[PDB]
Amino acid sequence: FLEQESGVQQARKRELQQAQSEAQGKLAMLNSQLKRLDEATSA
Amino acid sequence: FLEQESGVQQARKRELQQAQSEAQGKLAMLNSQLKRLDEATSA
Fold it and tell me: CA angle, B37 as apex, A22 and A29 as ends, to 5°?
């Protein structure tokens, strides 16, 4: 009851997925440009 | 009962997913143009 009244109940449940998905996708896609730079500098 | 009567019950349950999906997709796809600019400036 305490949680549903303005706590982790509606704090985390978005935080978890949004932060995880955003950070993972952004880091992988930023590594994409690193892979492409390696492509350019190799062949 | 209080929540279902005009509160977080129907406030958050869209807010969470819409904000998360929109923000994540928009930030990743905006980083797409950054990756493409790096492509252009590299090779």
Answer: 25
| Residues within 8 A of A (CB atoms), B 1-43 only | 3, 8, 12, 15-16, 19-20, 23-24, 27-28, 31-32, 34-35, 38-39, 42-43
Which technique was used to obtain these atomic coordinates? cryo-EM
**Resolution of the structure, angstroms:** 3.1
Residues of A with Cβ-Cβ distance to B34 under 8 angstroms: 33
Query: What residues have CB less than 8 Å from B31, skipping those under 6 apart?
Result: A26, A29, A30
Interface mutation vs chain A, best among B30, B36, B42, most A CBs within 10 Å: B42
